[PDB]
Coordinates of C-alpha atoms (C1' of nucleotides) and ligand atoms in Angstrom, one line a residue:
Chain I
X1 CA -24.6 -18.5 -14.3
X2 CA -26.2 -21.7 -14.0
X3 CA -29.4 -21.6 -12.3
X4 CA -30.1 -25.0 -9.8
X5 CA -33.8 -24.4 -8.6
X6 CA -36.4 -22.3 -9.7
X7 CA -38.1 -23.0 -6.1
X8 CA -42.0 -21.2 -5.6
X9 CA -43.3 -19.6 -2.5
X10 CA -46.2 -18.1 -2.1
X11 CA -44.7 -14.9 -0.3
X12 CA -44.5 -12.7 -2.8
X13 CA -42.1 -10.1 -4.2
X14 CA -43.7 -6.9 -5.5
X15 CA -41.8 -5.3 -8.4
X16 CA -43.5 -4.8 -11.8
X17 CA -45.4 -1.5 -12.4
X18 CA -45.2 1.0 -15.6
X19 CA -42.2 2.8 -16.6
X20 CA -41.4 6.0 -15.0
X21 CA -39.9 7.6 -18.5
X22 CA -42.4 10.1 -20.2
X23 CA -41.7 11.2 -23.5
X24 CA -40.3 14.6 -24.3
X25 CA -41.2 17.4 -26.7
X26 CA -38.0 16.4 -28.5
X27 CA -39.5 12.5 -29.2
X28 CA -41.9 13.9 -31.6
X29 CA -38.6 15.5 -33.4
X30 CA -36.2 12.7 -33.4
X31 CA -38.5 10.3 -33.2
X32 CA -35.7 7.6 -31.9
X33 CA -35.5 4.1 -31.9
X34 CA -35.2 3.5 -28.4
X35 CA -38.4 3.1 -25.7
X36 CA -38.7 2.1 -22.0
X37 CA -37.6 -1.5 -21.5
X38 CA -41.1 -3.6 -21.4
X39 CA -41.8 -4.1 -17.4
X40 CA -45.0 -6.0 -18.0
X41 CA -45.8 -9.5 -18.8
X42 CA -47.8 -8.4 -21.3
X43 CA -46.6 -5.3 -22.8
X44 CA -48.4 -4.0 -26.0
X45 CA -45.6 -3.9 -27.4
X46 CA -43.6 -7.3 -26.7
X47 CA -43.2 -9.4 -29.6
X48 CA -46.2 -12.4 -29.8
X49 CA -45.1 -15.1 -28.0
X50 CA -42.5 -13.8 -25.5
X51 CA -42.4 -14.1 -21.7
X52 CA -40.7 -11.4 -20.4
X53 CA -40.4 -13.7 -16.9
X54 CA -38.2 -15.8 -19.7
X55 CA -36.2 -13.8 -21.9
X56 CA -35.1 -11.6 -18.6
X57 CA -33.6 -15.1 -16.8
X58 CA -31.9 -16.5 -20.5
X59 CA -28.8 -15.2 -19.6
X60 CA -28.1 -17.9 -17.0
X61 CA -27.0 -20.4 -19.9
X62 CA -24.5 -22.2 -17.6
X63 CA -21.7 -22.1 -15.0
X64 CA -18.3 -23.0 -17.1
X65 CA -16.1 -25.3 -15.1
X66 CA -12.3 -24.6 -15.5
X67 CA -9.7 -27.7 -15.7
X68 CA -6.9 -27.4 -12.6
X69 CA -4.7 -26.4 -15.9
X70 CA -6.8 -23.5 -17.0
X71 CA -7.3 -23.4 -13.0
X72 CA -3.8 -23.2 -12.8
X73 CA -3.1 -21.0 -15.3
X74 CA -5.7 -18.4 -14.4
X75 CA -4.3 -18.3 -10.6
X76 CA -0.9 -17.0 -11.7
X77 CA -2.8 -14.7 -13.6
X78 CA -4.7 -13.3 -10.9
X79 CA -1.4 -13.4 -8.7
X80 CA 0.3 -11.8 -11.7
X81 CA -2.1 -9.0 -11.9
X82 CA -2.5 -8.8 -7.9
X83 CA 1.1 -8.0 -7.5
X84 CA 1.1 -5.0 -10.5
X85 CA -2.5 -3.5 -8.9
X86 CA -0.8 -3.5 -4.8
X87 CA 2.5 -2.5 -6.6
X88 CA 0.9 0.6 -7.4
X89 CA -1.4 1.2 -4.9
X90 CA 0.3 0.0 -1.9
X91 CA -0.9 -2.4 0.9
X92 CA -2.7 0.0 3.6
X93 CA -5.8 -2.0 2.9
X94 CA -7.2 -2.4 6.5
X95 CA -10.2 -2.8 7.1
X96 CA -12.7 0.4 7.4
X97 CA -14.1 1.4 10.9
X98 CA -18.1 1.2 10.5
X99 CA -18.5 5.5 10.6
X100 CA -15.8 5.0 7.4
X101 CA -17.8 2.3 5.9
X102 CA -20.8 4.6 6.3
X103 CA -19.6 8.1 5.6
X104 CA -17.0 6.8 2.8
X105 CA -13.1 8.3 2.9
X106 CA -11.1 10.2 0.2
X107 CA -12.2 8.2 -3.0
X108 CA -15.1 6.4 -2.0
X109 CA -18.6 8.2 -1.9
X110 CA -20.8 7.7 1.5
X111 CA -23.4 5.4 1.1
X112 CA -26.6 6.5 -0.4
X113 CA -29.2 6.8 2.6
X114 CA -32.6 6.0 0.6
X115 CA -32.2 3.0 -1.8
X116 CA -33.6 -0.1 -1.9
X117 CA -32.4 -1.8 1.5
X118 CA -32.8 -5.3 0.4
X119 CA -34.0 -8.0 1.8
X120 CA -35.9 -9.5 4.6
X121 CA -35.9 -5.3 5.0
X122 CA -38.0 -5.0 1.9
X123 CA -40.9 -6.8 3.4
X124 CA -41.7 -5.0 5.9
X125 CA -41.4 -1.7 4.8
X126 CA -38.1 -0.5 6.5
X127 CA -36.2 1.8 4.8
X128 CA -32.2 1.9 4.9
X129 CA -32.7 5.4 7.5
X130 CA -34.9 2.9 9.8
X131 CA -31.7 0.8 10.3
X132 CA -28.9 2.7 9.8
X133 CA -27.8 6.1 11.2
X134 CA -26.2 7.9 8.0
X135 CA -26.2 11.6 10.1
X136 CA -23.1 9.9 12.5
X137 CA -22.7 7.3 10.7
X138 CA -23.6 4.5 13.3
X139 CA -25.6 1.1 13.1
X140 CA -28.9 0.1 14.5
X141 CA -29.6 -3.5 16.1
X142 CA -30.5 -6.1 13.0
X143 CA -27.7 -4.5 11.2
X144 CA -25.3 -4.7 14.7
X145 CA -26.3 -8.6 14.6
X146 CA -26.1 -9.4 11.2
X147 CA -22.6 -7.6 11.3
X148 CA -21.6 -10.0 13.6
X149 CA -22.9 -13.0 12.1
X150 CA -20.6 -11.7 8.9
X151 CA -17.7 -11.6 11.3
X152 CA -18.4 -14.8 12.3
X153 CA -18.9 -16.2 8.8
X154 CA -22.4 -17.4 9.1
X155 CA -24.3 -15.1 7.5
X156 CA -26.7 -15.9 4.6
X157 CA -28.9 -13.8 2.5
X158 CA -30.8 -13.0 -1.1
X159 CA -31.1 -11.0 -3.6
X160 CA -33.9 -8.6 -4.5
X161 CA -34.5 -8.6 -8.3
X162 CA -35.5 -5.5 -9.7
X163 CA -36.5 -4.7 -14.1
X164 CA -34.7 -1.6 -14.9
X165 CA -36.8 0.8 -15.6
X166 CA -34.2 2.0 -18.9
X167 CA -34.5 3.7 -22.4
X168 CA -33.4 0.7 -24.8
X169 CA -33.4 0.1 -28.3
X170 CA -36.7 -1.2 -29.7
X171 CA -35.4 -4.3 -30.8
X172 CA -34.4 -5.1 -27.2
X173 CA -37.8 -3.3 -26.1
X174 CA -39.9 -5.7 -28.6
X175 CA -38.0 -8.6 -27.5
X176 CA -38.3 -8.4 -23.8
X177 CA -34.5 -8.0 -23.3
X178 CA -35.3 -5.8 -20.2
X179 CA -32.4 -5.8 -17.7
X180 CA -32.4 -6.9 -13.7
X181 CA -31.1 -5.2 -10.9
X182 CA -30.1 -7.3 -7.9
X183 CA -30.5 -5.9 -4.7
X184 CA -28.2 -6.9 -2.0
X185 CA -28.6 -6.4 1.8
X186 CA -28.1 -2.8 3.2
X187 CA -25.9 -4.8 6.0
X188 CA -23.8 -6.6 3.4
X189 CA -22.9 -3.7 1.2
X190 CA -21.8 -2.1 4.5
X191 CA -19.7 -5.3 5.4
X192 CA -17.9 -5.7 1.8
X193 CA -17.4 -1.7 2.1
X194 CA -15.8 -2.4 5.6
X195 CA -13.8 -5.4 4.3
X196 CA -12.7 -3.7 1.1
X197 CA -13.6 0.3 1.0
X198 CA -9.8 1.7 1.6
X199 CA -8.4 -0.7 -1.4
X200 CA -11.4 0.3 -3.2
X201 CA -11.2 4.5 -2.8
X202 CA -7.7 3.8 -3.7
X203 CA -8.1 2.1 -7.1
X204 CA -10.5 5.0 -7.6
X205 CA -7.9 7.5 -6.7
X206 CA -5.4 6.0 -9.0
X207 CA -7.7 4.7 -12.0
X208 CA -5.8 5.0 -15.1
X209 CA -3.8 2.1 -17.4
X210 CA -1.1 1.6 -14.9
X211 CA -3.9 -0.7 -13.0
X212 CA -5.9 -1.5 -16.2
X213 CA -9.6 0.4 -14.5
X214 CA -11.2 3.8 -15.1
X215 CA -13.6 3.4 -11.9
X216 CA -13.8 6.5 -10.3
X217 CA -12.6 8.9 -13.1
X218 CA -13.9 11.6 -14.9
X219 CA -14.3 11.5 -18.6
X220 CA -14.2 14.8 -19.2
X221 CA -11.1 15.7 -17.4
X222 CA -9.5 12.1 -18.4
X223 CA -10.2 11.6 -21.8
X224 CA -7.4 13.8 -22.4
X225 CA -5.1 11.5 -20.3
X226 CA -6.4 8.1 -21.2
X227 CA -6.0 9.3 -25.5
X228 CA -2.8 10.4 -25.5
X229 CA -1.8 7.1 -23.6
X230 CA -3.6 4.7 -26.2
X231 CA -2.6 6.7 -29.2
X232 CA 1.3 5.2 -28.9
X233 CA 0.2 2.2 -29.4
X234 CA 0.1 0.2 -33.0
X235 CA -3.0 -1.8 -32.4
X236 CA -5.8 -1.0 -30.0
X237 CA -9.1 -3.1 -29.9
X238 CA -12.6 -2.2 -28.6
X239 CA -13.4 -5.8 -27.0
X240 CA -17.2 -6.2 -26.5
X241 CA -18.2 -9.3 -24.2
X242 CA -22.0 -10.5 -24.1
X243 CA -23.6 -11.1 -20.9
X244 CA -20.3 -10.5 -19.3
X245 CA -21.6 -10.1 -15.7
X246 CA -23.6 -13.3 -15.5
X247 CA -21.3 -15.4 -17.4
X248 CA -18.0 -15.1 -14.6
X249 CA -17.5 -18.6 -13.6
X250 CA -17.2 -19.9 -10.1
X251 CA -13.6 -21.4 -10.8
X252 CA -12.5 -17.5 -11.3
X253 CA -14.4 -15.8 -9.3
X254 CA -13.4 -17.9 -6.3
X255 CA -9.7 -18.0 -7.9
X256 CA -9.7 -14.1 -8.0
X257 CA -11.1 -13.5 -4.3
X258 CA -8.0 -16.0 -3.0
X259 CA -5.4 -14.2 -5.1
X260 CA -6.4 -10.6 -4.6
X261 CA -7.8 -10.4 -1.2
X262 CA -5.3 -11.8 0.7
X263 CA -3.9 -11.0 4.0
X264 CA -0.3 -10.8 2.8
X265 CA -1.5 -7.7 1.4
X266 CA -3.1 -6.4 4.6
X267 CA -7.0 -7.3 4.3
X268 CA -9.0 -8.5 6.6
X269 CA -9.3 -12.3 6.5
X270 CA -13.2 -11.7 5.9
X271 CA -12.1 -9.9 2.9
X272 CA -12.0 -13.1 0.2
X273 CA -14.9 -14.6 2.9
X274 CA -17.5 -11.9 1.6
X275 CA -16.8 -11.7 -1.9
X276 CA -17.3 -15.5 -1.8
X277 CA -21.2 -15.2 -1.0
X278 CA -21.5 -13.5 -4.4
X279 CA -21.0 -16.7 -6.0
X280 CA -23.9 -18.9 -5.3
X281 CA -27.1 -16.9 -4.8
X282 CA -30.6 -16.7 -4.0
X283 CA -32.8 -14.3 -6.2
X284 CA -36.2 -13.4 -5.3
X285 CA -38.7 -12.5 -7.8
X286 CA -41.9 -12.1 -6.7
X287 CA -43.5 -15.2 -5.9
X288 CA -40.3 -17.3 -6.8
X289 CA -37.0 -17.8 -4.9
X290 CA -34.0 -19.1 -7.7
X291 CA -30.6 -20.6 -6.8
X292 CA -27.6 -19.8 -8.6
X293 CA -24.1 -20.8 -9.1
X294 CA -21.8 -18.6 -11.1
X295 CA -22.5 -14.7 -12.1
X296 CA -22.1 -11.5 -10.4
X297 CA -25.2 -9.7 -8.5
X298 CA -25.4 -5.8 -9.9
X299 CA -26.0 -4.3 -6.4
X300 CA -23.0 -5.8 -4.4
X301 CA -21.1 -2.9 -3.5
X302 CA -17.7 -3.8 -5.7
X303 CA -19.6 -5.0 -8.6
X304 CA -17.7 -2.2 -10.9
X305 CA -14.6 -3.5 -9.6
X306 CA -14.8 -6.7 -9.3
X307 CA -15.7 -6.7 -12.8
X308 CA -12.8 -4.5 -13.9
X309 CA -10.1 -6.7 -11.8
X310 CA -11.9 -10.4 -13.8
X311 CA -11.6 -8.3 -17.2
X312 CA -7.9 -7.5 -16.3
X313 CA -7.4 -10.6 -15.6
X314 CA -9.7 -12.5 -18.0
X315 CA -6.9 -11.0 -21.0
X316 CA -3.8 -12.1 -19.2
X317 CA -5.4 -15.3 -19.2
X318 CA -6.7 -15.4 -22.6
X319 CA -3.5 -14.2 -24.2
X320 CA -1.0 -16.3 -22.2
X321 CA -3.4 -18.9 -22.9
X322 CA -2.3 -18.4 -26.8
X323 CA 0.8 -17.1 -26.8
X324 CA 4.2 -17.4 -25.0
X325 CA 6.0 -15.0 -22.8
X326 CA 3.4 -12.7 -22.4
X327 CA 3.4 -10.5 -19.4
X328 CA 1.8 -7.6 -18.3
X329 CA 3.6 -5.0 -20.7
X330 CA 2.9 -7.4 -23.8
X331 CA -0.4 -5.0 -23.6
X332 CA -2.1 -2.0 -22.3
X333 CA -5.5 -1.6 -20.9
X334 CA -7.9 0.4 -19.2
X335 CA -11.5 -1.5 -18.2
X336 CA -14.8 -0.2 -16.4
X337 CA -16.8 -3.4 -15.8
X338 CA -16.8 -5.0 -19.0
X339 CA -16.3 -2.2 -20.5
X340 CA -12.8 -2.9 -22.2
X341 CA -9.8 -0.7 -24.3
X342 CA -6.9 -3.3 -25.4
X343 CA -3.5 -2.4 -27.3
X344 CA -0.4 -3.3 -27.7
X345 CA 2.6 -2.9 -30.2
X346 CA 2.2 -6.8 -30.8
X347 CA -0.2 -8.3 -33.3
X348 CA -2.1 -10.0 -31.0
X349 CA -4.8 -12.4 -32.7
X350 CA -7.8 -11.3 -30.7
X351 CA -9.7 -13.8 -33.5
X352 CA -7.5 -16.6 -32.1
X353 CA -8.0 -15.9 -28.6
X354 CA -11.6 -15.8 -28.6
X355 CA -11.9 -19.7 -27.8
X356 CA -9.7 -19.3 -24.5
X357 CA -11.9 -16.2 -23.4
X358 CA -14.5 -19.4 -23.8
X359 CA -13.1 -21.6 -21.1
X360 CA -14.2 -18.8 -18.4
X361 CA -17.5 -18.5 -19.7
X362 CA -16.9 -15.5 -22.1
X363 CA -17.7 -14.8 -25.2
X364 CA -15.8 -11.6 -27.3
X365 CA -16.6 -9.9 -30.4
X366 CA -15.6 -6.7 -31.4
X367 CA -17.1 -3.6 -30.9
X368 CA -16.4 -3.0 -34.6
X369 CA -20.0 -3.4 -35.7
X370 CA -20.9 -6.9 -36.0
X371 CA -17.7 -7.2 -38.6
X372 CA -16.1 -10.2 -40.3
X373 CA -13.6 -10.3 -37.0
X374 CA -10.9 -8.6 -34.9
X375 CA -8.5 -6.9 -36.9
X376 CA -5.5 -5.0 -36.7
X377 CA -3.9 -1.2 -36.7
X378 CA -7.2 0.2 -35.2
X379 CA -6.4 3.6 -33.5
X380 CA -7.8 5.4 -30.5
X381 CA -10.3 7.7 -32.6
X382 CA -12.1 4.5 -33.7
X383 CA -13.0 3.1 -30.0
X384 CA -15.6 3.9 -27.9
X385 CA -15.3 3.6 -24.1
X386 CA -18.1 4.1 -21.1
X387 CA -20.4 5.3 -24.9
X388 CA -18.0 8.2 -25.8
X389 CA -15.6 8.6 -28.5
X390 CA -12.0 9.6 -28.0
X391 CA -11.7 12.7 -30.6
X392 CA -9.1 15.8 -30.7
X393 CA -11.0 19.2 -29.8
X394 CA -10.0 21.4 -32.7
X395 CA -9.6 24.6 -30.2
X396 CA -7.8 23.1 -26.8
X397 CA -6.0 20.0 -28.3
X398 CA -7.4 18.0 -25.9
X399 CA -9.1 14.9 -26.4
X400 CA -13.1 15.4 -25.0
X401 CA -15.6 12.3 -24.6
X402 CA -17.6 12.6 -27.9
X403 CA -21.3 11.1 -27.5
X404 CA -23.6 9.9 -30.8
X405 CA -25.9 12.4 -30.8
X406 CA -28.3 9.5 -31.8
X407 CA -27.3 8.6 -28.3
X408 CA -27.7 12.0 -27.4
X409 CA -31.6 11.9 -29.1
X410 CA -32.2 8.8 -27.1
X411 CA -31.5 10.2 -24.1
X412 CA -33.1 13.6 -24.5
X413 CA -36.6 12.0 -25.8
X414 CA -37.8 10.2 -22.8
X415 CA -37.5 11.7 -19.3
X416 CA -39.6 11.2 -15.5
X417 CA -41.9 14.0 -14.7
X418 CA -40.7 16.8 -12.9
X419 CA -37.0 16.0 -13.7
X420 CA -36.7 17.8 -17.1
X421 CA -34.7 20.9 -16.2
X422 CA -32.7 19.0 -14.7
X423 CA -32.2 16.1 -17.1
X424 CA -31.5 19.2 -19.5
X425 CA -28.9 21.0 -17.8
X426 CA -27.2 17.7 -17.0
X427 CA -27.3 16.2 -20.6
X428 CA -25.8 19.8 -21.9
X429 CA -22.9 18.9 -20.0
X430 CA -22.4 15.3 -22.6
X431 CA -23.7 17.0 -25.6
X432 CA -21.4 20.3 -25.5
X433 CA -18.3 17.6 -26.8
X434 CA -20.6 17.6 -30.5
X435 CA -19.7 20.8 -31.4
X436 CA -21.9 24.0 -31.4
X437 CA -23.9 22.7 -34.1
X438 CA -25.0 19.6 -33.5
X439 CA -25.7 20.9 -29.4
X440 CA -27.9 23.6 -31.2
X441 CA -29.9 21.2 -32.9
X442 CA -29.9 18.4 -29.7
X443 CA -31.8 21.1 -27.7
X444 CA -34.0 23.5 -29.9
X445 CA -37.0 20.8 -28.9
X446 CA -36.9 22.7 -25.6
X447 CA -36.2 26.1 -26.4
X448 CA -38.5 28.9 -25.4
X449 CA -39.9 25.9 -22.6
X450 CA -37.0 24.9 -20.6
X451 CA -33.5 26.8 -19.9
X452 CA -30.6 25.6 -22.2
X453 CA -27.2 26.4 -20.9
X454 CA -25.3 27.9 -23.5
X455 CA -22.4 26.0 -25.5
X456 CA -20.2 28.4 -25.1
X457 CA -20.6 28.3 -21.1
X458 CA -20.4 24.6 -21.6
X459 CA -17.3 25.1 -23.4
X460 CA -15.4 27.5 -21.2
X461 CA -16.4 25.1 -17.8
X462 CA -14.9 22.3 -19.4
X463 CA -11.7 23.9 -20.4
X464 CA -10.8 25.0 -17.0
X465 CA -11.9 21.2 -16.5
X466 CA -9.5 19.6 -18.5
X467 CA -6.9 22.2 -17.9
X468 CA -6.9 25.2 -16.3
X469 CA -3.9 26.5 -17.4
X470 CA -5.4 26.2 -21.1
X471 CA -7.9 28.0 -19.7
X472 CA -5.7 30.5 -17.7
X473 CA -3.5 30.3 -21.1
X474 CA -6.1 31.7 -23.7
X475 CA -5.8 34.8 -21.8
X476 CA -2.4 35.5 -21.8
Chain U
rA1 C1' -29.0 -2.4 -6.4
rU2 C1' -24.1 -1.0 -7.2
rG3 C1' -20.4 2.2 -8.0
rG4 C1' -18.5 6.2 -10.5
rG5 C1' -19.0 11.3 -12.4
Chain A
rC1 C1' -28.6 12.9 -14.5
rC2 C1' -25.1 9.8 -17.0
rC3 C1' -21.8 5.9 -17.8
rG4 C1' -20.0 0.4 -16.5
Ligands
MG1 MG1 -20.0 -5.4 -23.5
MG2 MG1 -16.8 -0.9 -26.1

RNA sequence: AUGGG
RNA sequence: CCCG
């Protein structure tokens, strides 16, 4: 986004500290190229001549402004795409009572009852438990008020800007790429959940191409169903976007609200109203308070799917920007965020259509290494979605996510203390998809120190996973 | 933070 | 814990 005023206050905004990840037995071993993000202004390890405090804002480059044309354009394509998502779907999108909001509903998880609770919360040492009631799922008092400030559109508020404490790639590490996290209001996350919590535990529900989103799936259960869909198709691109989060425009972000949030399809009228507020916003770092138009804030509740409903819509735009008569079934696609699978039967010029992904804001390359290009007759075994792989398992049939176990090394070597076992168990569960081998070698680091499930166990769980009749089949 | 799992 |  484009940031208006770096504005300084002495009221201050604690965040900084060291990084919580500790190496691991298995660091010695596989000695990755990854590390804890630098959190510190001056890291012993950040490249001379970098301020963290900088590199961590330079992705706010600008705010893109749309012509009414392109304006024009991208509102059909929002309507366009509105239509097919509440085609599917179906319009019972009122709003959620607050004990729904709180508690969640078929589809969408309860709230979380200790995270950050945002701001002015944060300053005073409240906790999310001190002002809301997650056991019955009731409100207390600042959040009844600010509840009804929302209602009454006239509610204002900033975000908390955290570093994330993440493994990264050294080069990011020695060049102060760390990432933010933005955190929202407790009350606000409650609100958007009220305003758009049944429509969202129903995209989750129904994730899959049909809507073009894999929020709220499983990969280990849905590989198998989102392969065999993407491996009809002649062409299928992995699309990476850079900085795709804080480079949404105001023109379609406020475009997208009006189009997909609207009454005629049963929300609230507070619906597009709180989605709005995402788009100029007040960060709080520390000492400093920042203005800024254009981007999306991590924390908000939808920020998944608000990203996966622009990237649905950013390659109808795009593509009818370049081509004629293309509609929705010129292509397939399934998005998490801006995390993006593409195909189509068509030779689509995804080289071509990188300058009208520029008009939002965007800029595309392929995933495809930094190659000379997009090209053509890709297949689904050559992608990479949400960091897996799409390949066949030579027993079941089945497609199974597929991590690089130099992924998989990265993820093993650094860990919080007092959460190995844990980390263990739950990283067995990625790894099994390498094959017995290569999970052998992942873990032996640990062995004889920390309990390794077996592969085999691994393996059985996750064919009555992906198919229990494979499973109940095998012993026929 | 978020939201998934 | 892990992914966007
Ligand atoms: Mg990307
Ligand atoms: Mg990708």
């Amino acid at each position: 986004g484009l940031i208006v005023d770096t504005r300084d206050v002495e009221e201050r905004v604690h965040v900084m500290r060291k990084t919580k990840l500790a190496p691991t037995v298995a660091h010695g071993v596989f000695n990755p190229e990854f590390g804890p993000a630098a959190l510190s202004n001056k890291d012993p390890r950040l490249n001379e001549g970098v301020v963290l405090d900088e590199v961590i804002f330079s992705k706010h480059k600008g705010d893109t402004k749309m012509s009414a044309e392109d304006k024009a354009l991208f509102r059909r394509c929002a309507a366009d795409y509105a239509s097919r998502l509440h085609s599917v779907l179906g319009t019972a999108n009122a709003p959620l009572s607050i004990y729904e909001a709180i508690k969640g509903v078929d589809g969408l998880d309860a709230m979380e009852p200790d995270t950050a609770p945002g701001l002015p919360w944060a300053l005073q040492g409240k906790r999310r438990g001190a002002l809301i009631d997650f056991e019955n799922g009731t409100v207390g008092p600042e959040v009844e008020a600010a509840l009804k400030l929302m209602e009454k559109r006239e509610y204002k508020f900033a975000c908390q800007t955290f570093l994330k404490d993440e493994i990264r790639p050294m080069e990011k590490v020695r060049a102060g790429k760390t990432r933010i996290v933005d955190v929202l209001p407790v009350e606000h996350i409650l609100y958007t959940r009220m305003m758009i919590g049944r429509f969202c535990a129903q995209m989750h529900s129904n994730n899959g191409p049909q809507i073009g989103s894999a929020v709220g799936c499983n990969p280990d259960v849905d590989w198998q169903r989102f392969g065999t869909h993407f491996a009809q198709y002649r062409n299928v691109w992995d699309v990476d976007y850079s900085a795709f989060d804080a480079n949404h425009c105001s023109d379609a972000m406020n475009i997208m609200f009006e189009e997909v949030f609207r009454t005629e399809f049963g929300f609230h009228p507070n619906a597009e109203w709180i989605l709005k507020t995402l788009v100029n916003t007040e960060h709080a770092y520390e000492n400093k308070r920042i203005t800024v138009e254009g981007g999306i804030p991590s924390g908000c509740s939808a920020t998944s799917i608000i990203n996966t409903i622009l990237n649905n819509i950013y390659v109808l735009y795009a593509l009818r920007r370049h081509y004629e008569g293309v509609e929705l079934d010129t292509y397939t696609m399934i998005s998490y965020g801006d995390d993006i699978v593409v195909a189509s039967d068509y030779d689509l010029d995804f080289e071509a259509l990188k300058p009208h992904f520029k008009s939002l804001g965007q800029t595309i390359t392929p995933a495809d290494k930094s190659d000379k290009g997009f090209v053509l007759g890709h297949s689904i075994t050559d992608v990479t979605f949400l960091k897996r792989h799409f390949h066949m398992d030579y027993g079941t049939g089945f497609y199974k996510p597929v991590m690089a176990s130099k992924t998989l090394e990265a993820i093993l070597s650094f860990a919080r203390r007092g959460t190995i076992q844990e980390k263990l168990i739950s990283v067995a569960g990625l790894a099994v998809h390498s094959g017995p081998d290569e999970y052998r070698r992942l873990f032996e680091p640990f062995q004889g120190l920390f309990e390794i499930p077996s592969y085999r166990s691994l393996y059985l769980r996750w064919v009555n996973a992906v198919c229990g009749d494979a499973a109940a089949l095998e012993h026929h």
